[PDB]
Write a protein that binds this DNA or RNA. Structure first.
Ligand SMILES: Nc1ncnc2c1ncn2[C@@H]1O[C@H](COP(=O)(O)OP(=O)(O)OP(=O)(O)O)[C@@H](O)[C@H]1O
Ligand SMILES: Nc1ncnc2c1ncn2[C@@H]1O[C@H](COP(=O)(O)OP(=O)(O)OP(=O)(O)O)[C@@H](O)[C@H]1O
Ligand code: NA
Ligand code: NA
Lengths: 220, 224, 50, 228
RNA sequence: UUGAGCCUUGAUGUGUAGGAUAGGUGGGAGGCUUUGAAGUGUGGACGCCAGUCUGCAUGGAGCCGACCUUGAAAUACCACC
């Protein structure tokens, strides 16, 4: 019904405007859910090359809309500082072999360079899903107190697929339209700032905000 | 075309092989059960079969390296066995040179000449023999082991898989060299023309019965 | 004749080379001599090149 | 969509092939033939880029993948069958060895802190998390049974050892320098099998075998290296 | 008649281990269904041959999802390729 009626109503041949796209995105209201709407930007890079990859984290002014269960696998003083940041884990392997063995998973991974234990504890289970924080992405950092607050602040993470297109959470329908636009501008600027140096050609080609349960509309 | 020929030293007269029951298997069903065998001074005995059925493990335990649960293989009174293993890499080690490596293999010939000629007969120039014997490649590794049996003069020969890296001209020379050879050799080859033209007494290996003898190998396939 | 030309390029990083002749048929390996490099004014190793 | 270039090599007196100038590209498979002890193996060993020639004509194409089966078919009696196939991806293997020094290291350093993260993020970027499984399906696809997947290569028949070594080469590469002299695998059955695999695969491959008949069914061009 | 490029749509893509011929990125666990269903018979096409598949009314309104071995989740869903 909706999936066969949203097709004719909204046409993909024409490219829309930013202000209209947020309005049509909330216009649907067909599926009653949290509806964390999102955007997939066709980055222009050659993902076949290891030097053109884009992989980083940035913070949005309004947040992700959900608090990730950021366990802190940093043994030592990081655990003491990270205990007041709202983390559901301590710095040790206890939450990775017995806690993390039969347990399902956390939300985010806070890494401490002083402990090379959770690196192999996750292995093909906690790392095979990519939940391991990259050392250059701030997931594993020299400190643990500063990252914990920023992690709860909405430090979204974004990576290319095999083709080189990036899509990561920007907000929910519950957020007002003006908030989403600033959230979109936060991603694009940091994405454009972190765009690599061996990137021939036009970088951003397609930007299309999409509904979690609905459709997606081109923006520029 | 390298010129190789094998000549005997004592030439046993009655027979060479004597196998009662082999029953050798490494970690699965044994590759052969009894394999009663006799050679009778000739009978170039082309062992055959698809790869992975254990023709190389038969020859390895036929020469006495791998101990079988058999009852000995009972070589002849004055057998001089020459071995050309399927894999030949332990010989080409310890960074001996081409001239050095060839030299130790001899019994009565002189060290300077009569080994340069044998080594140089199979296409080894003057400057080619002053380089390490481990840096050789492919056919030259094989060609050394043909020269190895030149001076050794092995009365009884094996030649596990001789025509492996040879360049379609050494194969014609090797095929001609074994053709006029007097004596016994027990080789296992995978191609058809080398086995067909060269004298043969077939012993094919398939699970479980080891078929023995059909004549020319132009009749072994003709019987099919 | 059979003796061809080579150049011993310095190892001190600067571009300096002594040019000589070397027979390759007898010896196919490189040449290593400690010579004088006027650019840095020191005795350094000169590995064969070209 | 790229091609290769020219080289020149010499291991002593009387240099070997003296200013070769050729190009390999397209889909056609250049069957490379030659007499014993003359270029061939070491000519395309240079082409692989692991060792450089003397005259140094150079032949570069550093963007796409090269998979190379070699002549030393017994060069690994130790590595388990799954490890040899995985090692066909050069970047994955070298990364893992320096990564695998985690359980063998009883003490970690400060600089090791982000180093282990730097190697792990490279592991996930080229998805080494499926290399054992990705090879296993391919390894099973070339005829090797499951029960010998984890066994050592010392206890694998040399005829079977080529089926593993060809699976190592086939690792999604649009060219292969095949040193495959089908020496051990001459069952005709296995020979006929290898003729189908290469024929129905589109690559700018090179074959070196001495088998006159085998070169008929597969190769389209010949690159004889005989005189100089 | 036949090659080459481009747009549009639809189809399309396992062994290891299962309820199943699951492409990748993970946003999410509630959508779907009667702008006619579960199952029923009826035909293409494809098919490491079990099946995907969609013209078809009747039958008429329950199926899916989470879980489960797995390196990985699931045509439950939509989008960017
Ligand atoms: N040391 C060993 N341990 C376990 N299994 C072995 C061992 N040596 C051989 N085998 C197995 O027993 C059989 C004997 O094979 P072998 O290595 O003797 O060569 P082959 O069967 O004659 O092969 P080809 O014709 O390819 O040379 C094979 O199935 C092999 O996998
Ligand atoms: N490291 C080396 N340095 C100098 N010359 C060498 C070196 N290795 C080999 N050679 C010379 O190059 C020749 C060619 O060796 P190569 O490995 O190319 O064999 P090939 O001609 O391909 O033989 P086959 O067909 O039997 O495989 C050798 O016979 C030897 O004389
Ligand atoms: Na064998
Ligand atoms: Na070679």
């Amino acid at each position: 019904k909706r999936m066969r009626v949203i097709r004719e109503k909204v046409d993909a041949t024409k490219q829309y405007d930013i202000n209209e796209a947020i309005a049509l995105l909330k216009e649907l209201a067909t599926a009653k859910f949290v509806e964390s709407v999102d955007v997939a930007v066709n980055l222009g890079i050659d993902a076949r090359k290891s030097d053109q990859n884009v992989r980083g984290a940035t913070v949005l002014p309004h947040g992700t809309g959900r608090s990730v269960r950021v366990a802190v696998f940093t043994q030592g003083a990081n655990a003491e500082a990270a205990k007041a940041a709202g983390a559901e884990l301590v710095g040790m392997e206890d939450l990775a072999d017995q806690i993390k063995k039969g347990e399902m998973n956390f939300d985010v991974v806070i890494a401490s360079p002083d402990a090379m234990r959770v690196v192999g504890q996750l292995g093909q289970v906690l790392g095979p899903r990519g939940l391991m924080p990259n050392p250059k992405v701030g997931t594993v950092t020299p400190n643990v107190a500063e990252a914990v607050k920023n992690a709860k602040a909405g430090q979204v993470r974004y990576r290319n697929d095999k083709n080189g297109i990036i899509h990561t959470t920007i907000g929910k329908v519950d957020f007002d339209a003006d908030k989403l636009k600033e959230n979109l501008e936060a991603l694009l600027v940091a994405l454009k700032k972190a765009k690599p140096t061996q990137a021939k050609g036009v970088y951003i080609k397609k930007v299309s905000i999409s509904t979690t349960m609905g459709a997606g509309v081109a923006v520029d | 075309n390298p010129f190789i020929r094998f000549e005997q030293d004592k030439k046993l007269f009655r027979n060479a092989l004597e196998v009662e029951g082999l029953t050798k298997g490494f970690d699965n069903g044994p590759l052969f059960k009894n394999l009663n065998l006799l050679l009778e001074v000739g009978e170039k005995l082309a062992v055959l079969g698809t790869n992975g059925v254990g023709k190389s493990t038969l020859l390895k335990t036929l020469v006495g390296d791998l101990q079988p649960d058999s009852g000995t293989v009972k070589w002849s009174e004055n057998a001089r066995i020459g071995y050309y293993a399927q894999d030949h890499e332990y010989e080409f080690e310890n960074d001996l040179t081409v001239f050095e490596w060839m030299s130790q293999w001899k019994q009565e010939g002189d060290d300077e000449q009569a080994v340069r000629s044998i080594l140089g007969r199979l296409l080894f120039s003057q400057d080619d023999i002053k380089k390490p014997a481990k840096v050789l490649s492919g056919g030259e590794k094989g060609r050394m082991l043909f020269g190895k049996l030149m001076m050794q003069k092995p009365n009884i020969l094996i030649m596990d898989q001789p025509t492996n890296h040879l360049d379609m001209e050494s194969i014609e020379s090797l095929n001609m060299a074994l053709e006029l050879y007097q004596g016994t050799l027990i080789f296992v080859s995978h191609d058809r023309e080398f086995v067909s033209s060269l004298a043969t007494r077939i012993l094919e290996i398939t699970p479980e019965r080891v078929i023995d003898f059909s004549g020319n190998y132009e009749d072994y396939l003709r019987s099919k | 004749g059979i003796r061809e030309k080579i150049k011993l390029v310095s190892s001190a990083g600067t571009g300096h080379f002594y040019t000589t002749t070397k027979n390759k048929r007898t010896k196919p390996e490189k040449l290593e001599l400690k010579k004088f490099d006027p650019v840095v004014r020191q005795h350094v190793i000169y590995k064969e090149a070209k | 969509m790229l091609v290769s270039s020219n080289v020149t090599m010499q291991f002593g007196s009387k240099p070997l092939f003296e200013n070769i100038s050729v190009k390999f590209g397209g889909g056609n498979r250049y069957g490379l033939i030659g007499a014993n002890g003359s270029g061939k193996s070491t000519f395309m060993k240079i082409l692989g880029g692991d060792l450089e020639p003397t005259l140094g004509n150079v032949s570069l194409d550093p963007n796409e993948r090269i998979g190379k089966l070699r002549q030393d078919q017994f060069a690994f009696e130790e590595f388990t069958v799954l490890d040899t196939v995985i090692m066909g991806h050069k970047e994955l293997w070298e990364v893992k060895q320096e990564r695998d020094r985690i359980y063998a290291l009883p003490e970690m350093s400060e600089e090791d802190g982000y180093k282990v993260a730097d190697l792990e993020v490279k592991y996930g970027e080229m998805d080494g998390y499926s290399a054992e499984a990705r090879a296993g399906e391919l390894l099973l696809g070339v005829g090797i049974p499951v029960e010998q997947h984890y066994g050592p290569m010392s206890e694998v028949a040399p005829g079977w050892k080529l089926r593993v070594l060809l699976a190592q080469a086939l690792f999604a590469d649009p060219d292969i320098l095949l040193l495959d002299q089908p020496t051990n695998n001459l069952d005709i059955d296995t020979i006929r099998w290898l003729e189908q695999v290469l024929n129905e695969r589109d690559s700018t491959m090179i074959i070196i075998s001495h088998d006159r008949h085998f070169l008929n069914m597969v190769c389209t061009h010949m690159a004889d290296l005989d005189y100089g």
